[PDB]
Symmetry: C3
Subunit: 445 residues, 3 copies
């Protein structure tokens, strides 16, 4: 039992017309959701008849469903190139030709390159002429290049943002006979029950904080968070500098894909050539932000079977529920009971978005809520208690490798100490760029 | 009538100072705003005298006003260039000079060019020498270039961010005599009425979510949202890579404008030259985010009365109102009545920021609030009901082209099925970069 | 006294264990925090005995503690380069060698330079040959370049984001015996007192708005806000395009530092060479966002003891408090008293992130809350009133240089006019890039 009640009243509702007005006297209880696992135990008494009725209302979960917005596919790409050098006055290497080369025109040096539907480009670099470089003509020679992209892996990744976060509070309700039911509530919503009604009257749940983020789906392999804003168009140095509208087009490096300017770099070396890319590896990004991840005590994880991502509040929930009881009002509420907590472990890293996981062993005799805090109240642990002994865990963020933090916890208001002690690893500054490519295939030596 | 009351009590208020303490007995009611169009119907009874009065409070709107922060003007620019190639040892084409050319040095080749206050730069590219390139000297020739920018349109765009979102809750109150009045409430605000007072005692409204955004003003042509962080300094590939401190500076491409480094590309071709830019077209950006736009159930629109932008809550409203009645208390509240709802149409795109529009026909016999949800509650619809038949719409976000979703709706709690069905279009990945410029005009 | 009460009730609470029940009758009040400085004055009456008790609850502060995530060090860097031009067939200037030069290979031209652990790179640029350029050989000459980075100042900056914002609400309570005490509340937290309990039963405080941001620490000289998303990897044109894992690595410009590609530009001039950078100056960014800073009525400032940054609500506080009194209930609450307010000054910028500071002179005869709004309610002022005459200030945001805004204010609901007037300065579009570097030191052949 939890002490969740905020107000208790009697209210008459009148079906105004249909010429014959009907009134219903309802007992009213304004209660707080409190936290996941918190349970209001309400003994009701008949307003009119001498009758009693015991009700239990439990906050089971608080979820925000991500309704997706813009979306694209991407993957790991690598350049492959063909090269050929012609001396001045040989082949296409005349007057303006080399300096005038366009991206979309394939050189005659590569007449075997047929019809392509792959991301590709063509280049011509002026190299040295004269006897010193194997030519009779002393004017600049021409290095012709043809380059296409290819998928390193045969898997792709879909990046998307979230436009809507649709709240759903779920409650478990125990009736007088002990029969259990669940209900779902949206913002400003009401459900009817056997004994009256329950309504989410004030809702303060949402994504709040100071960081923009986005998500990645790996088909059949889960989701990942990206701790950066969703890039709307392809930009060099960002996730999605190459992007497509389908998984298959990533794998084939189809030409319908978009890419930011100048992603392919060229190192002319007379008769040798290197074409390289220094692109963001989206799979490295995925492995870091791999779900579940917790940010501002929202835990983002894969939905039941749904797919798509939800944000779970596994601790405190900020919502007011209005309870109306047909012809019954509050007689008394059930008092909270004390719990015993022991420290189990602290695992993870410091100065990182993923944070650290602290685990507790919590022993009690009734359902309720453990609340804990450090001295200055910068850390806050909120975990469920039950009849028996269960292990509960939540994410915390620290900025120090050697953690030794004293907390004060209780389920019933009498605080006792508890020392959280652990060793966290550092995560050194990283780069997601990966070099790809190398020597070209020389066509005519 | 909407069912909004959460508590009812009597409270006494006493003055603590003065020649004498005065006491006031007041009935007190705590209600939820519920949603736009929701109306609380309260019948009051006298606490000491035997009297009744009927009172009605309606939530008319919930607005967040944008108070702007940093701002800048931008637009569409194209490059114009002059070119002149000199053989080595001719003109300025001496020793180090070509490879040492500064952006702010104008070549003697272009003396005919007047005094400028336009964004401009100067380049020198080494080119081939010898008889093959029209020169006796075999050393590199010098291609001298003078480039300036010009506005492509004679209009500009103003980009800004929002630092403050200030809440204004608007209520319609009907007194006992049927007299209607309007009040506006901000955070922790109270306003006195004929019959007591009403105060916004708890406010949970605000901009939330996982996206940062900014806005654009097109002078005389409304507003647009940008689904991206406001960039505070000029950056290539971003809105505002060229920016100014005024509209007139954009139109004249004034030299006071800032631009990110290396925005003009050069393709030297001996005696031909191309100077191009690949700039973000801000007008393409404006059109895609043109207001009104909905994000996380906030509808962004131009404020009423000329300018600034606003965020409207057109469905759910999360706010608590404390009502105080002088010498009166709650007798009873009005019950909600049922809605009939029919699905009209569903129009728009999927997997897009703008979303899709569901339209419904709602028939009722009193003012209230339609509430609808799909099977797993990932979709939620809140629209106002009235006496009679009205069309109500709201934005939803889907991720599939063929939508067929069953909803359960009600105004009074008696839920009935409603099937939303339709076809949404795809929005293929886009790029706002547009190529501009071309060949130089050749001087000799 | 402030009028903060929202509801009042009686509840009976029963303990279920022991295996006989004890029941306690309690009076209940639901009040709003209202604002910093708001004070609820309750006189209580006995539920069973006839007795009176006096109680005072005051909102002292509402804080959001930043728990940090990813962090990195950065600073100001400048390049220094050595150059030496060799004619073709002299030194290493053979065949392919110049066009094939790798970044981490040091030329023989600079053997006199010892080995460094500094960020550095090496280049080779082809230049003109023949008699025109000081060579007998007509083939291209080689300009060899060795560049290294160095810190411009002997100080560094630490950039970080905030993953968690942990709420602490602070109340000052005067109990039945006149004893004054302070208590702290987290989300969904409860505290037992001499007279019952107070719980933070609904919390709507948190960071909201349409902007992402991050923070910088200047060691021993405070903090600054950055009005932009935290960049998770080094990127050109962004804060942190060069970044390190320690302060000492910034000062020594250590090679362990990461940098975005292509940060050093090269201008080869046959026997002259310039190496430059166009880097974001982080100290200019720091100065612009130096704390305290206010965004969406949250004031960001350094914590006391200077451990982290904090977000203060200095005006409105959106929170509901459930008060429970053992064997007592609400008799009456103290009425609000009136304010007189005079406009002092208006100082700051328009169309700026920092905004402008409005200062007011407020006179009252009791603690309370001044509330003000302009004609259309787009501007909102909430300041604390006290016994006597005090200066109160807060940040507003305007978009015009000549401000003249008409407000209506009150503490007790009786609105009176107040004219806010002043001149604000413009902050013209800026660029934080600063050019650094210059000519190389030329080695004698
Ligand atoms: C309010 O303060 C009263 C004394 O404060 C005096 O301070 C002077 C600086 C000047 O402002 C005088 O006008 C003030 O009277 C004190 O007598 C009252 O008891 C105080 N009231 C409360 C409710 O604490
Ligand atoms: C290639 O590019 C040029 C200009 O860049 C364009 O005019 C032409 O239509 C393009 N297509 C082909 C097939 O050359
Ligand atoms: C931490 O404790 C939990 C709870 O017993 C356990 O499941 C987990 O394996 C522990 N982790 C480590 C690293 O010991
Ligand atoms: C609580 O758990 C204990 C197990 O030791 C059991 O004996 C008791 O009956 C349980 N009580 C309830 C109410 O389930
Ligand atoms: C060119 O720019 C430099 C600074 O980059 C400046 O010192 C110099 O005066 C400029 N040249 C002219 C001719 O103004
Ligand atoms: C959809 O219905 C709305 C409301 O009835 C109407 O305004 C609109 O024209 C309709 N649109 C389509 C595409 O049918
Ligand atoms: C509904 O509107 C009709 C007019 O169309 C009116 O006659 C009737 O009184 C209204 N009913 C209610 C309950 O307001
Ligand atoms: C340059 O880097 C390569 C690895 O790519 C390494 O093998 C080589 O030894 C490095 N050169 C020097 C001089 O250390
Ligand atoms: C404005 O008034 C405040 C309050 O007294 C004062 O601290 C500040 O110095 C004043 N500023 C100016 C610019 O006059």
């Amino acid at each position: 039992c939890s002490e969740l009640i905020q107000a208790s009243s009697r209210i008459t509702t009148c079906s105004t017309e249909g010429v014959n007005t009907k009134c219903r006297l309802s007992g009213t209880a304004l209660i707080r959701a409190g936290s996941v696992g918190a349970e209001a135990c309400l003994m009701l008494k008949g307003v009119k008849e001498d009758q009693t009725k015991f009700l239990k209302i439990k906050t089971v979960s608080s979820e925000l469903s991500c309704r997706e917005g813009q979306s694209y596919w991407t993957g790991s790409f690598s350049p492959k190139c063909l090269s050929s050098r012609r001396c001045h006055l040989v082949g296409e290497c005349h007057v303006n030709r080399c300096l005038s080369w366009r991206d979309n025109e394939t050189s005659a040096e590569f007449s075997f390159v047929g019809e392509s539907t792959t991301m590709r480009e063509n280049k011509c670099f002026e190299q040295c002429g004269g006897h010193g470089c194997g030519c009779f003509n002393v004017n600049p020679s021409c290095l012709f290049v043809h380059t296409y992209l290819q998928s390193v892996r045969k898997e792709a990744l879909r990046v998307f943002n979230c436009i809507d976060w649709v709240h759903k509070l779920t409650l478990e309700i125990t009736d007088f006979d002990g029969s259990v039911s669940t209900i779902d509530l949206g913002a400003s919503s009401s459900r009817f029950t056997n004994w009256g009604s329950v309504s989410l009257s004030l809702d303060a749940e949402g994504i709040s904080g100071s960081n923009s983020f986005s998500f990645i789906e790996s088909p059949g392999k889960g989701y990942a968070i990206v701790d950066e804003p969703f890039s709307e168009i392809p930009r060099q140095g960002f996730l999605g500098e190459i992007r497509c509208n389908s998984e298959s087009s990533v794998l084939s490096a189809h030409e319908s894909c978009l890419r930011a300017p100048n992603l392919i770099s060229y190192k002319p070396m007379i008769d040798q050539l290197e074409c390289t890319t220094n692109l963001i590896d989206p799979f490295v990004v995925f492995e870091r932000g791999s779900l579940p991840q917790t940010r501002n005590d929202k835990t983002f994880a894969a939905s039941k079977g749904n797919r798509g991502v939800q944000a779970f509040s596994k601790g405190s929930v900020q919502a007011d529920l209005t309870l109306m009881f047909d012809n019954f009002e509050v007689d008394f509420v059930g008092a909270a009971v004390s719990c015993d907590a022991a420290f189990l472990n602290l695992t993870g890293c410091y100065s990182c978005n993923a944070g650290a996981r602290v685990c507790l062993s919590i022993t009690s005799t009734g359902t309720g809520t453990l609340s804990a805090h450090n001295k200055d109240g910068s850390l806050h642990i909120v975990l469920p208690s039950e009849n028996g002994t269960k292990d509960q865990c939540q994410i915390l963020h620290f900025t120090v490798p050697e953690v030794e933090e004293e907390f004060m916890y209780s389920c019933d208001g009498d605080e006792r100490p508890l020392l959280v002690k652990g060793t966290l690893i550092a995560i050194d500054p990283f780069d997601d760029r990966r070099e790809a490519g190398g020597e070209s295939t020389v066509v005519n030596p």
